[PDB]
Amino acid sequence: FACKTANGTAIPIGGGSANVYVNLAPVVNVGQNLVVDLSTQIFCHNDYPETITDYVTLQRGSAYGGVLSNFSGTVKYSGSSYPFPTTSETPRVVYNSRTDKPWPVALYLTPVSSAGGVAIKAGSLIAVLILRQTNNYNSDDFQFVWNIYANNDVVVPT
Ligand SMILES: OC[C@H]1O[C@H](CCCc2cccc3ccccc23)[C@@H](O)[C@@H](O)[C@@H]1O
Ligand code: NI
């Protein structure tokens, strides 16, 4: 089991870390959502689908910088929604193919009332998403750690 990003980088068999940049709407008001859909960026696959089933969870989701201070959020993982930052590990998604499949994670961030001005700085760390992978074969239990960086400024109009 391993993962990669679109025109980007890879995390190999056995886990590791990688940095991911995301495009963000440049202006968002109180009451509107920034949607950060990572499923167009992170893709994972099973390396032996004929004898092994891989199980993949969102173990944890954490907010940093401008998101942590100026936004409340939810996360959607494979059709279900959770608070963001997260309060527990999700149910699992099955990886049963050698073909790249998206990692179905999306952040929904809404500015808090105290947000105004540049609420997220370009190039700043906004979130960490941990992918935890296990299987039905052995005791492999691996973390794939995705550091999410803002590509651009996000302004909350006053
Ligand atoms: O995605 C399927 C699996 O692929 C890798 C390792 C499988 C390699 C392997 C090791 C020892 C005995 C094997 C016997 C048959 C097939 C693979 C074997 C690891 O990423 C596992 O965590 C993962 O569950
Ligand atoms: Ni592979």
Residue type (1 letter), 110? T
The domain that contains 123 carries what CATH number? Answer: 2.60.40.1090
Kindly state if the Cβ of 90 falls inside 6 Å of ligand 1.
no
Q: How far is the CA of 3 from the centre of ligand 2 (A)?
A: 8
Total number of domains in the chain: 1
Q: Is-contact 134 7, C-beta < 8 A?
A: no
Q: State the method.
A: X-ray
Residue 24 sits in which domain range? 1-158
Q: What is the DSSP string of 4-54?
A: EETTS-EE-TT-EEEEEEE---SB--TT--EEEEGGGTEEEE-S-TTT--E
> What is the spatial distance between Cα 144 and Cα 2, in angstroms, rounded to a whole number?
9
- Pocket of ligand 1 contains residue 100 by CB under 6 Å: no
Which two three-digit tokens encode residue 65? 């910088």
Q: Which helix (H) or strand (E) is 117 found in, with range?
A: strand 117-120
Q: Is 48 in the pocket of ligand 1 (CB under 6 A)?
A: yes
Cα 1 to ligand 1 centre (Å)? 8
> Residues 6 or more apart from 117 whose CB is under 8 A from it?
155, 156, 158
